[PDB]
Amino acid sequence: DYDLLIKNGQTVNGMPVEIAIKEKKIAAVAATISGSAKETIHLEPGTYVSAGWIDDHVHCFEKMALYYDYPDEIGVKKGVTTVIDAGTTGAENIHEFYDLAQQAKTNVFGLVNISKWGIVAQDELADLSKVQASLVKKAIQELPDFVVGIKARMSRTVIGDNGITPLELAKQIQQENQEIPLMVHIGSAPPHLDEILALMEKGDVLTHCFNGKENGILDQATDKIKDFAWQAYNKGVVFDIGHGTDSFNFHVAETALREGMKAASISTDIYIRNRENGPVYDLATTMEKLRVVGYDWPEIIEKVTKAPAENFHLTQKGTLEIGKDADLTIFTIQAEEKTLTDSNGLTRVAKEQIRPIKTIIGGQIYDN
Ligand SMILES: Nc1ncnc2[nH]cnc12
Ligand SMILES: [Zn+2]
Ligand SMILES: [Zn+2]
Numbered sequence: 448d449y450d451l452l453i454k455n456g457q458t459v460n461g462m463p464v465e466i467a468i469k470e471k472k473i474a475a476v477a478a479t480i481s482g483s484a485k486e487t488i489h490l491e492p493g494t495y496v497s498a499g500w501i502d503d504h505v506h507c508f509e510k511m512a513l514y515y516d517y518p519d520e521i522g523v524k525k526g527v528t529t530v531i532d533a534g535t536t537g538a539e540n541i542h543e544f545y546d547l548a549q550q551a552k553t554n555v556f557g558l559v560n561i562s563k564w565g566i567v568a569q570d571e572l573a574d575l576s577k578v579q580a581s582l583v584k585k586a587i588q589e590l591p592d593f594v595v596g597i598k599a600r601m602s603r604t605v606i607g608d609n610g611i612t613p614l615e616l617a618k619q620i621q622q623e624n625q626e627i628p629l630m631v632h633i634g635s636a637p638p639h640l641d642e643i644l645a646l647m648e649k650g651d652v653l654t655h656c657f658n659g660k661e662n663g664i665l666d667q668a669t670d671k672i673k674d675f676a677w678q679a680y681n682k683g684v685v686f687d688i689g690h691g692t693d694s695f696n697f698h699v700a701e702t703a704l705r706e707g708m709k710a711a712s713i714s715t716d717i718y719i720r721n722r723e724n725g726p727v728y729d730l731a732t733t734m735e736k737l738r739v740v741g742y743d744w745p746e747i748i749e750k751v752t753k754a755p756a757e758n759f760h761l762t763q764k765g766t767l768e769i770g771k772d773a774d775l776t777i778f779t780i781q782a783e784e785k786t787l788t789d790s791n792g793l794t795r796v797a798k799e800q801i802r803p804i805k806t807i808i809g810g811q812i813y814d815n
Contacts, residue, residue, distance in 0.1 A: 449469045450485050451807075452486070452488070453777075454487065458496060465477060465478065466767065467484065468810050469810075471772065471809040494779060497752060498756075498766050499807070500776045503755040503758060504716045505715065508532060511566070511567075515719060516718045516722060521715075521717050521722060522554075522555070523808060526776045528807070529555075532558065534559065534560035535560070536559065536565040537564045537565040539582070545593050554774065556594075557595070558594070558628075560599075561616060562577040572601075575609055575612070575613070580620050580623060583597060587624050594627075595760065597621065597630070599617040599631050601643050615646065628652065630654055630687070631647060631651060632689070634660060635662050640673070640676065641673075644675055648684070651685065652712075653679070654694075654716065656689070664699065677706075685712065686709075689715070690714070690715050690726070691717075691790060692720070692721045704741045713747065739797045744801075772809060773810040776806055777804055
């Protein structure tokens with residue numbers, strides 16, 4: 448006896464798979480599962496199945512000013528079972544966000560911005576009084592089932608004249624909360640990338656890793672990846688895509704690949720505006736971009752499941768292991784040209800498209 452059984456599936460590696468579900472958890476996984484269940488799904492031959500896709504850089508607090516979106520429009524409806532809001536809210540408004548986040552079909556987690564009001568303004572790190580370690584600690588102790596880390600947006604328009612100081616505070620706050628995961632956003636200088644990378648350690652997540660700005664990882668003068676960027680990479684700093692409206696450049700990603708560098712995790716930095724009007728329409732589209740860059744589907748899948756799950760300690764998600772939460776994404780991969788545009792207007796023609804057709808969350812089935 449099981450609650451749900453999925454048959455005739457196949458992993459991205461070409462492995463036959465069937466999953467048995469009971470009590471919102473994965474009860475069994477094998478090439479063939481002969482058992483009874485309330486409902487049984489019979490997938491069409493050639494259909495792929497993986498752990499529920501996870502987008503670890505999102506903005507889905509629907510009540511926020513401009514930077515917002517609706518959880519299920521970027522989640523379940525796009526084959527994404529779990530999303531992590533990248534610091535849209537601070538300790539002062541995360542509760543209002545948390546309450547709304549519960550009514551979503553999609554699992555929603557969040558990073559608390561070190562600035563108490565989150566991204567209300569554009570420069571929430573320009574006024575240091577807003578960065579109270581105490582308030583962050585309280586949020587972390589108040590919502591352990593929701594807060595999986597802290598966001599620090601280290602770029603020109605955010606920090607005003609406070610330079611690198613906000614990051615030091617971020618590292619201190621991390622120290623004060625059991626080394627909770629820290630996500631670092633980079634953009635234009637100040638601060639300079641090298642100064643930022645120097646303070647980050649293995650486990651710290653560097654989002655917008657392949658942005659094409661001058662202060663990015665590519666040395667535009669030599670057309671090579673800066674040495675200190677390789678150093679941070681080599682020491683374990685987790686490179687996260689966080690595509691966004693202006694943070695993903697094809698040339699940078701391609702150059703990195705040629706040098707043997709790949710992002711650890713693929714994310715969208717999506718919000719209603721770049722979702723509706725592009726350049727980032729959804730996770731699938733972002734995945735197709737790294738596919739065209741050169742990554743293969745198996746590693747791509749791992750980068751939107753196991754990796755993000757590990758980056759933020761989602762111990763119960765990310766893999767099709769017995770005992771884990773029953774979150775799955777069922778999709779197809781087809782040969783069909785499609786135009787893809789990055790954050791800087793560079794275009795590439797994709798030859799393969801990935802499309803979710805069924806999404807399972809906590810054992811519940813959702814079509815499309
Ligand atoms: N991640 C981001 N979101 C909104 N505005 C920005 N300006 C620079 N980076 C940004
Ligand atoms: Zn950002
Ligand atoms: Zn963002």
